[PDB]
Amino acid sequence: MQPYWAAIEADIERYLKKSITIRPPETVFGPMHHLTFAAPATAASTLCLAACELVGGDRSQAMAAAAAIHLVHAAAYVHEHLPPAIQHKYGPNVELLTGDGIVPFGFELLAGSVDPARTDDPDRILRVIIEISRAGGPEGMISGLHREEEIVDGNTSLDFIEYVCKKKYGEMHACGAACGAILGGAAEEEIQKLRNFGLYQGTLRGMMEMKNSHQLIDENIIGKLKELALEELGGFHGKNAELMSSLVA
Amino acid sequence: MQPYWAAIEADIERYLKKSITIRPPETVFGPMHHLTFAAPATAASTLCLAACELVGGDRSQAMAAAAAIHLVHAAAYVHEHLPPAIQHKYGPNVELLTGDGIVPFGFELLAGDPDRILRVIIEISRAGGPEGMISGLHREEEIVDGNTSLDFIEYVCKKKYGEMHACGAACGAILGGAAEEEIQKLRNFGLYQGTLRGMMEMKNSHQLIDENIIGKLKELALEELGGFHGKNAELMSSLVAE
Amino acid sequence: MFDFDGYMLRKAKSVNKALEAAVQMKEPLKIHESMRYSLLAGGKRVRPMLCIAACELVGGDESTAMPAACAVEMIHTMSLMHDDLPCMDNDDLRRGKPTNHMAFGESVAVLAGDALLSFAFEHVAAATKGAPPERIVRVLGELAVSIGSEGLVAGQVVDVCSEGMAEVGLDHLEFIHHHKTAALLQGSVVLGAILGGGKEEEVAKLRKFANCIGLLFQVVDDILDVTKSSKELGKTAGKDLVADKTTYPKLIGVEKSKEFADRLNREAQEQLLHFHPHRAAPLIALANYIAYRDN
Amino acid sequence: MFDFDGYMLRKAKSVNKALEAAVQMKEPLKIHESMRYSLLAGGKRVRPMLCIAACELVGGDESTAMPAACAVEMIHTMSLMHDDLPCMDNDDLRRGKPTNHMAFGESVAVLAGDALLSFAFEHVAAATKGAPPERIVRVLGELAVSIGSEGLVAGQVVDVCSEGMAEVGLDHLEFIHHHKTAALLQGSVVLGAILGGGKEEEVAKLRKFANCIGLLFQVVDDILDVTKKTTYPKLIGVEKSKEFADRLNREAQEQLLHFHPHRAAPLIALANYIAYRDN
Numbered sequence A: 001m002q003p004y005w006a007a008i009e010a011d012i013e014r015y016l017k018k019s020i021t022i023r024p025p026e027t028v029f030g031p032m033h034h035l036t037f038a039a040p041a042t043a044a045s046t047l048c049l050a051a052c053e054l055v056g057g058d059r060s061q062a063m064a065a066a067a068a069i070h071l072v073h074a075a076a077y078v079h080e081h082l083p084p085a086i087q088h089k090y091g092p093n094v095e096l097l098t099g100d101g102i103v104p105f106g107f108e109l110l111a112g113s114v115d116p117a118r119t120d121d122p123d124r125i126l127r128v129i130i131e132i133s134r135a136g137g138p139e140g141m142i143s144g145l146h147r148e149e150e151i152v153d154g155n156t157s158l159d160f161i162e163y164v165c166k167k168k169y170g171e172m173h174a175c176g177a178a179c180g181a182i183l184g185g186a187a188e189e190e191i192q193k194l195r196n197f198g199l200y201q202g203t204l205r206g207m208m209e210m211k212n213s214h215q216l217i218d219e220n221i222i223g224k225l226k227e228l229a230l231e232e233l234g235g236f237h238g239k240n241a242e243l244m245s246s247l248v249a
Numbered sequence B: 001m002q003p004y005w006a007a008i009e010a011d012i013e014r015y016l017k018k019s020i021t022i023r024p025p026e027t028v029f030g031p032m033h034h035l036t037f038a039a040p041a042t043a044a045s046t047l048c049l050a051a052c053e054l055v056g057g058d059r060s061q062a063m064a065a066a067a068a069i070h071l072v073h074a075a076a077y078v079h080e081h082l083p084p085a086i087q088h089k090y091g092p093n094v095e096l097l098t099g100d101g102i103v104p105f106g107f108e109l110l111a112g113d114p115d116r117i118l119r120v121i122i123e124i125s126r127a128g129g130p131e132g133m134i135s136g137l138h139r140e141e142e143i144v145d146g147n148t149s150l151d152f153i154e155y156v157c158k159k160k161y162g163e164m165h166a167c168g169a170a171c172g173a174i175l176g177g178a179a180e181e182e183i184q185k186l187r188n189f190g191l192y193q194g195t196l197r198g199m200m201e202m203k204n205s206h207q208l209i210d211e212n213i214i215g216k217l218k219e220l221a222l223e224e225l226g227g228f229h230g231k232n233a234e235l236m237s238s239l240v241a242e
Numbered sequence C: 001m002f003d004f005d006g007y008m009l010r011k012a013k014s015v016n017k018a019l020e021a022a023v024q025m026k027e028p029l030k031i032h033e034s035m036r037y038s039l040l041a042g043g044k045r046v047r048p049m050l051c052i053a054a055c056e057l058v059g060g061d062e063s064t065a066m067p068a069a070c071a072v073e074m075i076h077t078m079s080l081m082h083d084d085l086p087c088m089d090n091d092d093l094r095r096g097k098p099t100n101h102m103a104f105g106e107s108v109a110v111l112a113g114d115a116l117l118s119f120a121f122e123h124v125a126a127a128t129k130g131a132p133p134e135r136i137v138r139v140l141g142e143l144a145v146s147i148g149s150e151g152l153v154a155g156q157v158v159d160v161c162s163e164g165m166a167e168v169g170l171d172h173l174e175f176i177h178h179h180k181t182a183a184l185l186q187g188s189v190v191l192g193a194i195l196g197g198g199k200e201e202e203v204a205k206l207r208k209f210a211n212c213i214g215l216l217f218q219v220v221d222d223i224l225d226v227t228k229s230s231k232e233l234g235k236t237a238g239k240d241l242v243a244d245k246t247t248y249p250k251l252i253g254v255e256k257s258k259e260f261a262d263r264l265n266r267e268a269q270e271q272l273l274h275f276h277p278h279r280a281a282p283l284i285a286l287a288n289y290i291a292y293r294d295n
Numbered sequence D: 001m002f003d004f005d006g007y008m009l010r011k012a013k014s015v016n017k018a019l020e021a022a023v024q025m026k027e028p029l030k031i032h033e034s035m036r037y038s039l040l041a042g043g044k045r046v047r048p049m050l051c052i053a054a055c056e057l058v059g060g061d062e063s064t065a066m067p068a069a070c071a072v073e074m075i076h077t078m079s080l081m082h083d084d085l086p087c088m089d090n091d092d093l094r095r096g097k098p099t100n101h102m103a104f105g106e107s108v109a110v111l112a113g114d115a116l117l118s119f120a121f122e123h124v125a126a127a128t129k130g131a132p133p134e135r136i137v138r139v140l141g142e143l144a145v146s147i148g149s150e151g152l153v154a155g156q157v158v159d160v161c162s163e164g165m166a167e168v169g170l171d172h173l174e175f176i177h178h179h180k181t182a183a184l185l186q187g188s189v190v191l192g193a194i195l196g197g198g199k200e201e202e203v204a205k206l207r208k209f210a211n212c213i214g215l216l217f218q219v220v221d222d223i224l225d226v227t228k229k230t231t232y233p234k235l236i237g238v239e240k241s242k243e244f245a246d247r248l249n250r251e252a253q254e255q256l257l258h259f260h261p262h263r264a265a266p267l268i269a270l271a272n273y274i275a276y277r278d279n
């Protein structure tokens, strides 16, 4: 619960720091390092490691994906935050470019994590690069960031807002869980279930990020989503098999 | 146009007349009859009969589907013209309701072998639904005469005409008993041919549609027709060529 | 003893869950948001419930009837969306909220309505399980016939054109209500009985049944339009008091209309004697509810 | 070779056909419309051609390298869509026509660009046929290396932070040109070369070829500007810049010596072209 989920985030951050070394030219790696760890963590990364271990995989098998996922998320975060709305350590131009350096670095980490002594690595990695690129592409995350700008604080329906959160956060979390199951060696039914769970978990999650502003927070939407989420976990019976149900608290 | 297509278009008219006869109450069947033929002829309807004839089957097997496709088109047409942008023969409420009655009649003709009819109802219903022709009607309300790109306009045409044509070709290949690989080829042919027809007619509006867009859709269509042969294959090709 | 409220509560709950899962938000967002705004607004769900009850009455099970049940509730909803439009009745309240067109525009409202009708056919066709293709095709046909020019629509068009006749006979007012309200309730009951495996004789009895409650439903809708306030009904009430529409509370009065609703009910229930009272209890309760509801 | 212009024309055409098919108009319409606006604006397509050329050079066929070919053009496209943004170079035009954010707005242009960047990986990864998985993954890695913090982006970032610093030495100028131009040409040749089945030794020669002609391009543009800040002429003179160009061109071509002459010809043709342009 508290300790397990925290150790996951700490492992993900420890992998990132080891991977992104501030070295010359600091004008490039300084902002790349700063912006990667200034973005809030995304449960999508966490879910990736959790799902890999849930199916019998070793945590190290999904670390590169978990990291790729946080990086796509961070780039997205930086880009939605410019305009000069507030004070930023790095100027708008270096933030945008760095967002463009963070995404490919995610793929580099993944391609570079193929162990040639492991014969099942290429196929599983190729498939995950496809998942992450789709989830953070024009039919996923990007769809949500775009539609989000149509939301008028107190004059937008709940149906539309949930759609924005399914695209903005749900697609990514579904990705996270599925990639975790794939890298863990899970069979298709397992992967599908975990994907679906992730989809609802992420949508619910995003729904809470929305609360703050458009306070119209309906407990029914929260019940329909958590309910659907849990109705997907029918097969995995245990703690981790029923722990996932902890964020939904 | 061409007499082969005018001939097939006319067999469909005869069947629609044969099926929709004015009778009491006439305040219902008059508008139904009138509005069915007030809608322009759609090639989505004749493609069905053709695609079916191109794969060994006889058009008499795809007639009901061809008719349904037309009626689905009629209803959409009626609806995209409620106001009196002009002087209609019937009031906005009778037109509105007649469209609502046209579509079910298309399904009624089909319901009246059953594994393919089921598959066709799914095709037509999906093509006339929120994710097909209606997405096109909806997005079209946005096209500003000289402020809208060709990319956006081609899209609306793909949704408004393309999907119904792709669907016509598909239902025809399905009804003639063609194989999956063939249905897809024909479905794609319809898709492009229909998008093409939409561009021709959208040309009348703002004349900025270069022959490059037209050649692309043309080329994409015939490429899909590769693999087919015979008289009927060239007749099918004259739908985009000529 | 049969608890009708607990029955209607779980069946409505089950139908609203399938409706919500059947019509999801997706591009084009406005079309879908408008489809959902009216569909999940909050109707009594009499039609799908009748569909499911008829299915379970002949041996079938809810899951086979659910897609069809949602389909009649979709077409029912779109027929109301269009009915409220400025060129039809121009109403401003429906299912407790502003009418669709007031919230999305006449264009989207019209479109969303059309999408519901179309999708109803897709859904039943592609999602129904526990019935062979022939059954499905057949059901789709009854659905078609009940809402088209020999069904719902005919009733609604003869209703807007017969909005002038001040000499309407009980045969012109009969035609109106049977087509614009009975035909869909007939389709709802029939759809479920066929998908339930029912035999021709049973289906025929039930059709005759739906007929009586179908006319009963309308007769009662006209009384509610003359005795209840718009807030209460959740929709715009009263415009049948002025407009020269063909209603029962006019050509015979409200009290004689009530009386009539009473005969209609008894007749419907007398059709149900075809079945064992134990299995007929749900449809018997739905028939009363249709009779004594307050909205 | 013969008709080098006709060869380039055929490659761009075939590539323009694959790009159009890969990035279709779809919901959300403004994001796809924006992607297509800058991706299909037509151009020379030297990057896709370098990828294809490199594939057939080592024995592969165009078909196999096509998705990767479109990928590098996608990348090139979004790097330009972003370079024009208000916070960057803030330009209203590019190739005589309005920049992406001028017709779609800043927000959409930023996001359209991001879409092209991630779709490039999705497309190479899921559409490449005729190659084992470890081969396509290896190529995704190479693409990622050539466009990130040690490739394109670095060039773009070091350029952005060096515009108020008038005094800049040769080493600094070569860093920017290498990363901002060569890095993506190198990635293009190495994706083709590896998808075509080439050997490590063949891939390594090609990597040198790309680096030589990418730099060659920047030195020649500096020579023509003066024979029509910091430039090769201002640092070492036109005389030297030209010596350097000829040396860059010779070394590039020396790399193609042990390849079949016929397959190598288009590439050799491309080096001379860049080397002897008149504009």
Ligand SMILES: C=C(C)CCOP(=O)(O)OP(=O)(O)O
Pocket: C042, C043, C044, C045, C046, C095, C180, C181, C217, C218, C221, C295
């Ligand atoms: C009287 C007719 C034909 C329609 C209104 O019916 P309903 O009363 O069934 O309305 P809802 O419950 O669905 O809201």
Ligand SMILES: CC(C)=CCSP(=O)(O)OP(=O)(O)O
Pocket: C079, C080, C083, C089, C152, C156, C180, C181, C221, C235, C236
């Ligand atoms: C019968 C159909 C399709 C719609 C309603 S007829 P009506 O206007 O009498 O009913 P409403 O008051 O609008 O509910």
Ligand SMILES: CC(C)=CCSP(=O)(O)OP(=O)(O)O
Pocket: D079, D080, D083, D089, D152, D156, D180, D181
């Ligand atoms: C070549 C790359 C990566 C970016 C644009 S370079 P630039 O802004 O110096 O010049 P242009 O706008 O390409 O004319």
Ligand SMILES: [Mg+2]
Pocket: C083, C084, C089, C091
């Ligand atoms: Mg009304």
Ligand SMILES: [Mg+2]
Pocket: C221, C222, C225, C240
């Ligand atoms: Mg009423």
Ligand SMILES: [Mg+2]
Pocket: D083, D089
């Ligand atoms: Mg620049």
Ligand SMILES: [Mg+2]
Pocket: D083, D084, D089, D091
């Ligand atoms: Mg520039």
